[PDB]
Amino acid sequence: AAHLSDMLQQLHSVNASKPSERGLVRQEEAEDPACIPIFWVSKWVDYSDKYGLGYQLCDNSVGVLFNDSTRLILYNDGDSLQYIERDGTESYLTVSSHPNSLMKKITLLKYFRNYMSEHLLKAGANITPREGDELARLPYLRTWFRTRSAIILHLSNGSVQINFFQDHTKLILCPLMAAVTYIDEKRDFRTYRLSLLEEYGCCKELASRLRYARTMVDKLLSSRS
């Protein structure tokens, strides 16, 4: 909510600057590879009719947002878990500890994990994420929704990812860095500081996707509240 309103302001500001109408567009001068995200969604699978939405983060951790609004996350060590209930209660445990209260959901999570590992490509596989406190909280998927053109994924660290179905382009927006990472059709990745994009401008494709992004963040804030 705090991070989302900040994201909305940052997007309203860049779009208000009409970055694609600059007489001298200099997109490259808005890049800042130091702002590369730590986390993004590399895979997802929509089983919402029965169980929920499963996903994998670029660090090979997996998570599930169950239909009952709980979330279960399995770290990339294959054993550490974080469970978040609908009221917000979080717990840390291990699969190997055999938690009686969670074996069904662990089994479902493992089903999701095996589906994605065998069938799906890893988004951003050509990217080494930024170095953070590898030591600090793994985010979880706070909410998601689909439109006819994209899937919108909102992470608990405030990031918002939008994957476009038609051309496989993707945006990863981070309100903490006020940055956007754009993955184009050719899977080339560029990270921009939004404030620099306002000075230097950008191409019509990125400008259009950023207008769409503002609309989706607007929808995210409205549904939350």
Binding site: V41, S42, K43, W44, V45, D46, Y115, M116, H119, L120, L121, A123, I151, N163, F165, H168
Partner: peptide, 5 residues
Amino acid sequence: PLHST
């Protein structure tokens, strides 16, 4: 789409 690429 029911799943990513």
